[PDB]
Every structure is written in structure tokens, then in C-alpha cells.
Ligand binder design. Structure first.
Ligand SMILES: [Mg+2]
Ligand SMILES: [Zn+2]
Lengths: 57, 55, 257, 33, 89, 101, 166
RNA sequence: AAUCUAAAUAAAUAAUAAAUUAAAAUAAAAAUUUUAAAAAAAAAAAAUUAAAAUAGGGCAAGUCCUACUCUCCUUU
RNA sequence: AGUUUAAUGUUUAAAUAUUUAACUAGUGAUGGCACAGUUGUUCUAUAUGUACCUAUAAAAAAUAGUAAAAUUAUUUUAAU
């Protein structure tokens, strides 16, 4: 099981306090906050985002 | 303690007027004209001049 | 209402008025009594500085009064000072009255008899015209290094009307603790009552030996066994008093020669 | 006598036997400086 | 903290650092990896920790100055002996 | 404590026992009691006779240090050297007193 | 001869190294001492970092004539350790040419340092290692050119609201 | 009534996945409720989080130990 | 005035201490050396025989898949 650490290891630089300092809590946070974006983005962002465009027109 | 505290928990410690007033306050002072040493008011030396007339 | 709102007994606080109310209990709210073992934060009680027991506190009230009389200044610390100055205004209230009731009511209280022999002689002469506030409570500045207890300098009032401490200086303590205190040079021409300065060197005589210079050497081993930082080894604690410091004083007793 | 040499091994000298003899007429040594 | 109603950025080198001190990078085979590229200028000048006097209170000179600092209540024991018999080699 | 800062000092050494300065050997001459003996009465019996006792370690004196010479327990505390004549004369049973044959 | 590459004209030059790092160690030194600063590190200040350091952030950014004052008053240990420097550092600063008066405290930071391990013997056969802590004290006296040393000879503000108007 | 401050100093322990959520109310669905959801909106005490340790159960496989008309050797 | 109780203590100053109740009369017993592990000793409680008697110490790979804890290398290319 490969946590893609070197793909997240340099991106904790924009998390907040405890996540940046320690690694096994830093990854766990981002590899979740990343794991929910790319799940929010595929199935949920449109049917929200395409409702601002409908509420506008 | 059933949890460790992130800094934002340790940092709230430093906002109340209990931390500030205990550690982070500068004392008001002035130069004892007789001893030329810094001094607070209401306190004097063990010395005749400092003890007869409070500098 | 008809009964007191707070019945017979309840401790109000430090910083609270008397709020007199009909009650069976007895409260002084006045402390004109001399040399009294009424220590407390109330009104009719002098401040109870901390100690192991109201007995041991009374034992601290003895060696801190008999050392203010012995040498007119004692650098006392914390809530002992407001508790001592009221014992310096009592000793004079005991030394002024004079009757052989009082001279014992202080004899019961002082660890040493020469003090009750002193207090009754200088103080009637000294404070013949002062009628209250005989002790001056001037606070030293640097809080103790061993704890933040404050250090007040309680000294008896006017000494220029004294007979024992006429023109002494207290800007600094005696060099070896058995050496008499430095004198103001403007009044260097002062001699003392003999019974005061002949009994002193009787006491100061034991530290001028070598058996105390062994108890001095030794003590520095205790404070290291108990490890106390910054205590020189008993191998470089060369004596306080010595033969070179002998020659001056036997020739400083030229009066009896 | 025992001690630690600058290296660190405890280099204890051989043991001996103080024998305080007591002569009749006292003896002395002079040292001119 | 500090802050005099002024947003000085914060407590400087203090509050956050004292939370997880960084593990010390160990040498492999005693090698320093980029030794053969970085210059030989004394490290006092490399990252910037350039100090005019590095006074050292771990010294027999300043033993009086250390004993000047510590609190009288800070009793230190075993001044004239040690619990472990020092004469065992 | 007239210190203003307590310590291993300014702890008034004897705030009692004001009758100092005892000339023991001088007084021991009046009692005719072996001046070397009388002075031993007034120090813990560990220090003079061959008795089980507890010594402080600084009292023992250190090896020759780089800072200080070898300070033996005697040359710093002369009046604490045990006197084993005075021990034996007083405390131990001599062969003489029980010699039977 | 080891060469360290430097660029001079857009191309890099295989310049000798022993002569290149002797040019740094003289330049970086000359680029550091000609400053109006004075950095001074006291080490093994016998105090933990939690304590010692929070008593520094009161001093960070104070004139040394004030810092040497706010230190001598407070009975804390952190203020007595730094005051040990502010009399030694300025004692060395005045040699560098730095002013005795206009000198400031630029950065006064605590540096985590050596930590002994002492055996502690808790009750009921449990042990827990007490670690006697010690820190390092990094102090950079800088020089403020226009710093007006305020007159401190009037009782803090007994000069008013305690003295009657006129 | 007594003795057991704060502060200054030295600096350990259980526990620690995280928290910005935690509150609070209501329904739940397998459960005690906790979640999910909706909808809100410094110091003492021990109501909740594990304020507890550790006892209390009963089941499973494993071993233990004691007992006698029915099993079996080393057996004196 | 050290011991059948009770309070405190509850990682405690103690891997049993502080205070205290009770008890206390031993010419028959804290004690010379003597008994040792399928066994000693037992005024017998399956109690103890060096601070859990399941003795210590030592030597094994016993069994533990039969609901214990684990079993290390992303971007794949046929289903139940
Ligand atoms: Mg999409
Ligand atoms: Zn002064």
C-alpha cells in the first residue's frame, strides 16, 4: 500500500499547524481532504456549480 | 487528557489576561537619584539616604 | 430580619467591614493590647504571618523581636513586617509603662534577659515624647532570591535620642557577624554603655575561637551534603577571626588598660 | 595510592606499611633557602 | 505572546517551534552527502549564524557565572561523592 | 536572619547560648581531668573515641584536585582527629587487667 | 586543483576553489562585521525553553538601557540570564565600534539545547526519567541610529493624578 | 481557631488518531447512544467523553489441578 | 509505644507506611545447624520454602487458523 507520500510530502506546505509539523498526521489530513475533493468534484460540484449559472441566467 | 493539543490549543493559552498580566508586562521604573540604579516606586535601598528620604 | 441575617457565626473575608449586628459571639475589632498572641486577618488581630503552628509562630515572634531590640534594625520578610512593627509599638508600650508587671510581661516574651534589661532603659529616654508609630517599615526593593517574599526594613524611630545605637550605620551588615556595626564618621567620638558592649563581646567571644572555626568549616560540609549551590569547600574557608584581627581589639580595649 | 591516569585506567600503586618508629633523641633535617 | 495592539507578526522564534523539535539528520557511513560541493567557509557564515562571541557557560571559567544564575532553591546533590562507586573499572 | 537574602550565611549561628567562650582546658585544669579528655566531651563521640559514626563526605576531604591539593580530613579538622590513646585508656580492656597464669 | 564554477559573463568559469572559498570567507566576514549589528550567543543558560523563552518576548525590541532595566527588576531567572548578556554583549559591542547608548535588541531568541537525563524514582516501583533541561540564548544587539533614550528620572507617573492640579 | 497560597525556581505521571467545533433540540437504524441529517446557535466542581483502574459474567478452542465400583504402564 | 480495628494514604514518604482500636505475662522460642522441588515444612489456609509458589535459574522454535495482532512495492485492463 503506497500513500503517494512524495506527491503529498511537499504539499503539506499549505495545510495548517499540526499537519505541517508531523508527517503521519499531515498526510492523513491531506490524503483525506484530497480524497474528498476528487470525490466532491466528480459527483457533486456540477449539480451545484451548474445551478449558479442557472440561477444567473 | 484524552487528547493531545495542537498549537492552536496551546496558543489560546496566551490570549487571556492571565498569561499576559503574569508574564508579558513591562514594569514601570525610574532611576533612583541616589543610587543611579533602576528602581520601582515604593521600594528603597538598605542605605541611610535611601531610607530617611525615600528617593 | 429579627434574627441577624447571617446567624451567629460566619467568616466574612479579608477586607470586610465590621457590620456590627446583635450576636452572642465576641469580636474585638481593636488591638490596643501589648505583646499579644492574637494573629489573624481580622481587625482586632495583627497579621498572622505564616508558620508551622501558633506556637512556632510565637517562637518566630520571639527571635524577631529580641533581634530588633538587640540591634535596632531587622530586615524582616513579608507579612512578618506588618506583624513586627505592631510588636515594636508594643515593646515601647511595655517599656514606657515601666511597672514590674510589664517588665516581666516582656521577660516572659524575650529569649534573653539582657534585652529586657535594655528595652526598659533606652526606650523611655528615646521615645519619651513619641506616643505611637515607633517602628518605621521601609520596604527594600529586591524581592528575596529564595522566594518572592518582600523584604521590609523595620527600624525603630529616632536613634539620635538613643544611648546604645547613637550614631551607628546600617547601610551594610557587620563584616563577620561578631564585629560591632560601622559608625557614622561625623560622630566617631561616641562610647557606649559598658553593660551593653561588655556583654556583647562576651557573646561574640565564642566565634573568635577555633572550635567555632571548626563548626564553620564543618557546616560547609553539611550544606554540601544537602547540596546547596555555591558553597565553598571546607578546605578554603580560612577563619573569620584571626590573630592578625586579634591585635587591634585587645589594643582597642585601651580603656581598661 | 589510587588514581585515574589521563587515559582513564585506575592505576593503583602498590601497597605499603607505615611504620612510625620512635627514636630516643630527636632527629631533624635542615633546608636552606 | 506579546502584541501591543499592533499585529507584530507573532512571538517570533518561540510558540510553534517548541512543539515538535526536528529529528537530527544522521550521517550514513559518516558521509556528509553534499560535502563535495558546498564550500569550506566556516558554517558560522554559511546559513547566517554568525556570532561575535559564543560565550559558553559549560566552562570552568564561567562556573561562577552559572552559580550566579541558578536559583538558591535549585539544590544539586552528590557534590562530594557519587552513588556509583567510581573505583570500579 | 538579618540577611534580606537567606542562604548558607546570615543564618544567625546561635540565636541562643549567649554564654560563649568556654576555656575548656583552662577549666579542665581546675577539675584535674586530663585536658585532652575534657575537650572530647563536647564534640560528638564519633569524633574522638573508636565508635560507630556518620561523617559528611566533604568533611572527609578530597583527593588532590587540579584546583586544590590533597586536603586530608585531619589538616582541615585538627580537633576531630580521634585520640586512640584516650580511647584505649578509657574504653577497651587491657591484656594486663585480666592476665591470669 | 578543485574548481568551483562561477559565472562572470553569462558563461561559467572553472575558477580555482581554494582561492574562491578564501574570497568568500573574507567577503562574508567583511559583509557581516561592517553592519550595525552585534550577534552574541550565550549557551547552557540553565533553563527550559517553555519558561525561558516566554520571558524573552517581552524584551524583543527594547532599547538596551530599558532591557537592562526591565531585567534587573523582575525576580525571574530568564530576565537575569539575559541581563548577564546585555552587560557582556554590550561590553563586547562597544569594542566593535557599536554604540553603548543607541543599541537595541534586534533578535533575542531561545535555542533548545543540551538536556541531561536524570533518574527519578516514582512511588511503587515506577521510574520516570527527569531530564534536567538547558537552553541556548541567541541575542543580536543592533544599533538604532535615531533612538531617543527617554528620560527615566520621574517616578513612573506619580508626576500626575497623585500631585494636585497646579 | 489551628496547619495545608499565589507568585519566583526546579519539571515528573497516567492518558494522547483528530479536531475549531463543541453545545443544545428532534427523528433514526443496527445498540446503550454516537453518529448521519435537520434545525439551531483562569479556578473550582465530576454530567459526558475510557473520571478510571479492574472486578463481574457466560461461550470457544488450549492447558492446568483434584477425585472415585467401572479406562490404563514404568509400582517398590 | 512498634502487630486482629478504623481513618489517611491509593504510582502513596511504603510494590504496605502514618495515626489509632484491640491484644499483650511465652521453663518452652524472631534465633546455634538441619531438612529442597512429585518435593521440604505445615497447631491444615491447597498456605508459605528470598520481595505474585505458576519456586527461581537454565534449554527448547510445543501448540495459537480453527472468529487474537500483523504480513512491505499507485496509475490496473475481462465477469459471477
Ligand atoms: Mg464534472
Ligand atoms: Zn537607593
Amino acid at each position: 500500500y503506497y500513500r503517494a507520500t512524495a506527491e503529498l510530502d511537499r504539499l503539506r506546505g499549505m495545510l495548517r499547524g499540526r499537519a505541517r509539523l508531523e508527517r503521519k498526521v499531515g498526510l492523513k489530513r491531506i490524503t483525506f481532504l484530497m480524497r474528498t475533493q476528487t470525490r466532491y468534484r466528480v459527483e457533486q460540484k456540477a449539480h451545484w456549480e451548474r445551478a449558479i449559472v442557472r440561477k444567473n441566467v | 487528557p484524552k487528547r493531545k493539543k495542537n498549537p492552536m490549543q496551546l496558543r489560546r493559552k496566551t490570549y487571556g489576561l492571565h498569561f499576559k498580566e503574569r508574564y508579558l508586562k513591562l514594569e514601570e521604573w525610574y532611576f533612583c537619584p541616589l543610587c543611579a540604579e533602576p528602581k520601582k516606586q515604593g521600594e528603597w535601598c538598605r542605605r541611610e539616604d535611601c531610607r530617611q528620604i525615600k528617593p | 430580619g429579627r434574627p441577624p441575617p447571617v446567624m451567629g457565626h460566619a467568616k466574612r473575608m479579608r477586607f470586610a467591614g465590621v457590620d456590627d449586628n446583635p450576636s452572642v459571639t465576641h469580636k474585638p475589632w481593636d488591638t490596643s493590647e501589648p505583646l499579644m498572641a492574637d494573629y489573624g486577618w481580622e481587625r482586632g488581630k495583627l497579621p498572622k504571618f505564616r508558620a508551622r503552628s501558633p506556637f512556632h509562630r510565637q517562637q518566630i515572634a520571639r527571635r524577631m523581636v529580641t533581634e530588633l531590640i538587640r540591634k535596632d534594625y531587622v530586615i524582616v520578610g513579608g507579612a512578618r513586617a506588618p506583624a513586627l512593627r505592631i510588636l515594636a509599638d508594643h515593646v515601647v508600650e511595655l517599656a514606657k509603662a515601666g511597672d514590674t508587671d510589664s517588665r516581666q510581661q516582656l521577660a516572659y516574651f524575650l529569649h534573653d534577659p539582657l534585652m529586657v534589661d535594655k528595652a526598659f532603659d533606652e526606650y523611655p529616654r528615646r521615645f519619651r515624647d513619641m506616643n505611637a508609630k515607633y517602628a518605621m517599615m521601609t520596604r527594600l526593593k529586591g524581592r528575596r532570591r529564595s522566594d518572592n517574599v518582600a523584604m521590609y526594613f523595620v527600624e525603630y524611630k529616632n536613634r539620635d535620642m538613643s544611648d546604645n545605637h547613637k550614631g551607628e550605620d546600617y547601610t551594610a551588615g557587620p563584616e563577620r557577624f561578631f564585629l560591632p556595626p560601622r559608625i557614622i564618621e561625623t560622630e566617631k567620638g561616641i562610647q557606649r554603655p559598658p553593660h551593653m558592649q561588655m556583654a556583647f563581646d562576651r557573646w561574640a567571644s565564642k566565634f573568635k575561637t577555633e572550635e567555632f572555626h571548626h563548626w564553620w568549616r564543618l557546616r560547609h560540609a553539611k550544606l554540601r551534603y544537602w547540596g546547596v549551590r555555591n558553597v565553598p569547600h571546607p578546605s578554603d574557608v580560612d577563619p573569620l577571626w584571626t590573630e592578625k584581627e586579634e591585635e587591634e581589639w585587645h589594643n582597642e580595649m585601651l580603656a581598661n588598660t | 595510592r589510587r588514581f585515574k591516569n589521563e587515559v582513564g585506567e585506575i592505576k593503583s600503586l602498590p601497597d605499603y606499611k607505615v611504620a612510625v618508629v620512635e627514636l630516643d633523641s630527636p632527629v631533624s633535617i635542615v633546608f636552606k633557602q | 505572546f506579546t502584541y501591543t495592539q499592533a499585529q507584530m507578526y507573532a512571538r517570533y522564534r518561540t510558540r510553534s517551534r517548541f512543539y515538535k523539535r526536528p529529528e537530527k539528520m544522521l550521517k550514513a557511513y559518516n558521509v556528509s552527502p553534499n560535502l563535495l560541493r558546498l564550500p569550506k567557509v566556516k558554517p558560522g557564515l554559511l546559513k547566517g549564524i554568525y556570532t561575535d562571541e559564543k560565550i559558553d557557560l559549560r566552562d570552568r571559567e564561567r562556573l561562577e557565572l552559572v552559580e550566579s544564575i541558578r536559583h538558591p532553591k535549585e539544590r544539586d546533590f552528590y557534590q562530594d561523592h557519587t552513588y556509583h562507586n567510581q573505583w570500579i573499572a | 536572619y538579618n540577611s534580606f537574602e537567606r542562604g548558607w550565611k546570615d543564618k544567625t549561628v546561635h540565636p541562643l547560648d549567649r554564654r560563649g567562650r568556654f576555656n575548656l582546658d583552662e577549666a579542665a585544669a581546675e577539675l584535674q581531668l586530663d585536658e585532652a579528655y575534657v575537650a572530647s566531651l563536647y564534640k560528638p563521640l564519633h569524633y574522638t573515641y573508636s565508635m560507630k559514626g556518620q561523617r559528611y563526605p566533604a568533611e572527609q576531604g578530597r583527593t588532590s584536585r587540579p584546583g586544590s591539593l590533597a586536603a586530608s580530613r585531619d589538616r582541615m579538622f585538627p580537633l576531630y582527629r580521634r585520640n586512640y590513646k584516650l580511647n584505649r585508656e578509657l574504653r577497651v580492656l587491657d591484656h594486663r587487667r585480666i592476665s591470669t597464669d | 586543483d578543485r574548481w568551483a564554477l562561477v559565472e562572470e559573463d553569462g558563461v561559467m568559469y572553472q575558477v580555482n576553489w581554494k582561492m574562491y572559498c578564501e574570497r568568500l570567507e573574507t567577503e562574508l566576514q567583511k559583509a557581516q562585521d561592517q553592519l550595525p549589528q552585534y550577534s552574541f550567543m550565550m549557551k547552557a543558560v540553565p533553563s527550559a525553553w517553555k519558561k525561558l523563552d516566554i520571558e524573552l518576548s517581552v524584551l524583543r525590541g527594547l532599547s538596551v538601557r530599558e532591557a537592562m532595566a526591565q531585567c534587573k527588576l523582575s525576580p525571574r531567572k530568564g530576565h537575569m540570564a539575559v541581563f548577564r548578556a546585555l552587560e557582556v554583549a554590550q561590553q563586547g559591542a562597544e569594542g566593535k565600534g557599536l554604540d553603548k547608548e543607541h543599541l537595541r535588541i534586534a533578535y533575542i531568541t531561545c535555542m533548545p539545547g543540551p538536556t541531561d537525563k536524570q533518574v527519578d524514582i516514582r512511588s511503587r516501583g515506577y521510574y520516570a526519567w527527569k531530564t534536567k533541561k538547558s537552553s541556548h540564548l541567541l541575542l543580536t544587539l543592533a544599533e538604532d541610529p535615531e533612538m531617543v533614550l527617554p528620560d527615566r528620572t520621574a517616578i513612573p507617573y506619580a508626576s500626575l493624578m497623585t500631585m494636585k492640579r497646579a
